[PDB]
Amino acid sequence: ALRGTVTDFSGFDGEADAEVLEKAMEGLGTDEDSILNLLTARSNAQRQQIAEEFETLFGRDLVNDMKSELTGKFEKLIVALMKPSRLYDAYELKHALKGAGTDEKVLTEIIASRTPEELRAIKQAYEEEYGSNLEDDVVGDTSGYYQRMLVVLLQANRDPDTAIDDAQVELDAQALFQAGELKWGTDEEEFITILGTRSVSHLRRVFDKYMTISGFQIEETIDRETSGNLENLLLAVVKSIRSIPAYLAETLYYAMKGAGTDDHTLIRVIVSRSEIDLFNIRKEFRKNFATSLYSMIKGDTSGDYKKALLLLSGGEDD
Ligand SMILES: [Ca+2]
Ligand SMILES: [Ca+2]
Ligand SMILES: [Ca+2]
Ligand SMILES: [Ca+2]
Ligand SMILES: [Ca+2]
Ligand SMILES: [Ca+2]
Ligand SMILES: [Ca+2]
Ligand SMILES: [Ca+2]
Ligand SMILES: [Ca+2]
Ligand SMILES: [Ca+2]
Ligand SMILES: [Ca+2]
Known part of the structure; x- marks a missing residue:
């Protein structure tokens, strides 16, 4: 089920790739496009091979050469892509x-x-x-x-996913209800132990049951019971239990929906997830936000920064 959006390039040639990047830098200006088209079309493991091959051919450090030829938010992405x-x-x-x-x-x-x-x-x-x-x-x-x-x-x-126990599910659902909505204040430790240590498959069942017995979704209760630091974390854990792709899809949306762009987050999420579940992330993003990830990145970013992001992301037609 779990699909990234960047994979190994077939017919990958480490030395050819270095030569290309060299050609895009050596001389007046910088061919952003050529750097941007190549690196977003090679996997992390392959960039490493390009960076090592570049050194053997030119006696220069690829990453540092690019740092001195690139600028602003674009450089930040490329550098993150190279890590x-x-x-x-x-x-x-x-x-x-x-x-x-x-x-x-x-x-x-x-x-x-x-x-x-x-x-x-x-x-x-x-x-x-x-x-x-x-x-x-x-x-x-x-x-x-x-x-x-x-x-x-x-x-x-965390507990490993195992045979699902109906008794445990009702018991844990009740503990959370008694620890939150039923209690004056909050038994933070109960939330923590339960949401922190119980298995993923088990907790998903506990959530459904929590809703059935409380009328609230666990996320509403967490908001009603906690604030700042702790709220965000428990909310984060819960959403990740439900679906990491969906949690991270929400993360991107909120990084872009205001007046600015939280570029630091935009970059980290796209780069780190490009080879694990960014495809899943895109599906969930569309599912929950009415537009494709692509269209929002297109709306919030400009220049080569934008071009790389979109190529990294894909899914204009999601
Ligand atoms: Ca140059
Ligand atoms: Ca240029
Ligand atoms: Ca620079
Ligand atoms: Ca309470
Ligand atoms: Ca509280
Ligand atoms: Ca307390
Ligand atoms: Ca709150
Ligand atoms: Ca510190
Ligand atoms: Ca701080
Ligand atoms: Ca914005
Ligand atoms: Ca950082």
Whole structure:
């Protein structure tokens, strides 16, 4: 079911590709198009091969050459596109912790929507690159239940999908109801333990049951019961439980629907997901927002920045 929008180019020729990129830079100006048409048509693993082959042919660093020939939001995308898949999430996480004021949005998005396999892969890569323990770093930069929930999630420990138990589903649905709507204040720990540790397949069933017994969708209750930090995280986790593609589709929409563009988010989501579920993301986006992902990117962005994004994205006809 899970489909990306960028795949390996067949008949890929690492050296030819380098020569092309060289031809697009060496001399007066810069052939943005040629760089943009090639790199959005090669997978992450293949860009790495292009970057290594470029060095052997020209004794120059591809990425740095492009940094010195490109500009603005376009350069940012290309640079993000060039970052090894393995290191990308950890890179965005590191920059989100760096400096006194943390970037919660990024922590929540990534940690709430990455599968256990992925999260433990991120943790190892992050410790390899930076010599810091990710969990420890997150603990240092967050606080309260938001910190607690993140720590729980970072254990990469969630129950595995298993035989579905009707008794457990009713029990857990009731616990959430008793912990939220029925209680003066909120049993934050119950929400956290349940929404943090229970399996995906199990929780989807618990949601349907929660609605049946409470009249509320769990998302309404989370909004009615919590605020800021914690609300966003629990909302993020819940939506990811339902559908990571649908969660990330909503993430893109909200990055574009206002007066500006949250370009930092536009870029991260498109790039990181281009080889996993961006096709799924596009389907869900259309499904929930009346237009294609394409048309909204077209409306919010300009120039080569726009051109690359659209080629990366695809689906003009969604
Ligand atoms: Ca040039
Ligand atoms: Ca030019
Ligand atoms: Ca530049
Ligand atoms: Ca960043
Ligand atoms: Ca910080
Ligand atoms: Ca902050
Ligand atoms: Ca309450
Ligand atoms: Ca509360
Ligand atoms: Ca409480
Ligand atoms: Ca609220
Ligand atoms: Ca906008």
